[PDB]
Amino acid sequence: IVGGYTCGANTVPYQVSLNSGYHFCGGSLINSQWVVSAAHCYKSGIQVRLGEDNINVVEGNEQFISASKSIVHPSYNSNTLNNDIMLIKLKSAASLNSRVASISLPTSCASAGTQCLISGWGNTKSSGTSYPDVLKCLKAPILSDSSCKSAYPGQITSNMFCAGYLEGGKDSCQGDSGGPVVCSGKLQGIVSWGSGCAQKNKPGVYTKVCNYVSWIKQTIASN
Ligand SMILES: NC1=NCc2ccccc21
Numbered sequence: 683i684v685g686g687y688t689c690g691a692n693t694v695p696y697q698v699s700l701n702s703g704y705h706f707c708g709g710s711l712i713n714s715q716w717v718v719s720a721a722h723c724y725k726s727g728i729q730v731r732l733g734e735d736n737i738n739v740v741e742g743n744e745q746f747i748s749a750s751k752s753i754v755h756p757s758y759n760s761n762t763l764n765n766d767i768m769l770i771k772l773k774s775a776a777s778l779n780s781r782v783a784s785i786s787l788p789t790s791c792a793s794a795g796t797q798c799l800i801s802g803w804g805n806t807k808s809s810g811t812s813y814p815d816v817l818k819c820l821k822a823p824i825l826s827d828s829s830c831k832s833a834y835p836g837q838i839t840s841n842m843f844c845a846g847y848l849e850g851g852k853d854s855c856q857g858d859s860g861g862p863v864v865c866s867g868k869l870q871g872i873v874s875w876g877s878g879c880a881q882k883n884k885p886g887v888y889t890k891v892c893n894y895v896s897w898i899k900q901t902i903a904s905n
C-alpha cells in the first residue's frame with residue numbers, strides 16, 4: 683500500500699496473509715472455512731495466516747492453518763487477469779473472534795464514488811522497494827468505468843474496476859495482491875493489478891467480486 687497508513691493491530695480482522703515460507707499475497711476470510719484471494723496468487727502448499735498484524739512477529743492472536751484445496755475460477759485468464767479470483771479452503775475451521783472475522787459478500791455491485799478500505803502488506807514506495815511488517819490501510823473511492831478504461835485502454839473487462847486517485851500518490855502495490863477492497867461492509871474487490879504503483883492516471887485495478895457471488899456460494903456449498 684502506497685500513501686496509506688498503519689491500520690492498527692487486528693482492525694481489519696478479515697484480512698489474511700498467504701504464506702508459502704514467506705508472505706506472498708493477501709486474502710479475505712469469508713466464513714470459518716473459506717478464504718477469497720486472487721487467482722494470480724495460486725500456488726500449492728499455501729498456509730493461511732489469520733489474526734496477523736506484524737507478519738514477522740508472533741504477537742499472540744494468530745491462527746496458522748494449511749489450505750486443503752484451492753479453486754481457481756474456471757474462466758481465469760492469466761494473460762489478461764480476467765476473472766482474477768480463487769477460493770481457498772482451510773483444513774480446519776478458523777476460530778472466529780474479534781480479531782479473526784469474516785467479511786460479507788456483496789448483495790449487489792457498488793457505485794462509482796463509494797469509499798472503500800484497501801489493505802495489505804505490500805510495497806509502500808512508488809519508486810523503489812520497502813515492505814512493511816505491519817498491515818497498511820488506504821481509503822479510496824471506486825472510480826468511474828470510463829476513467830478506468832481510459833487509463834488502461836483495451837485491458838478492462840466487466841469483471842474489473844478501478845479504485846484510487848487519478849492524481850496518484852495513493853494506491854495498492856506488489857504484495858497486496860489477493861487482499862480486500864471493502865466498501866460499506868461488503869467485499870467488493872480483490873487487489874489484482876496496475877501499472878506501477880501510485881502513478882498519475884494509473885489507478886489500481888480490482889476484481890469485481892459482485893459478479894462472482896453466485897459462483898462463490900455454489901462452489902463453497904459443493905466443496
Ligand atoms: N495497484 C497496483 N499496481 C501494481 C500492482 C501489482 C499488484 C497488485 C496491485 C498493483
Ligand SMILES: [Ca+2]
Nearest residue numbers: 736739740741
Ligand atoms: Ca504476527
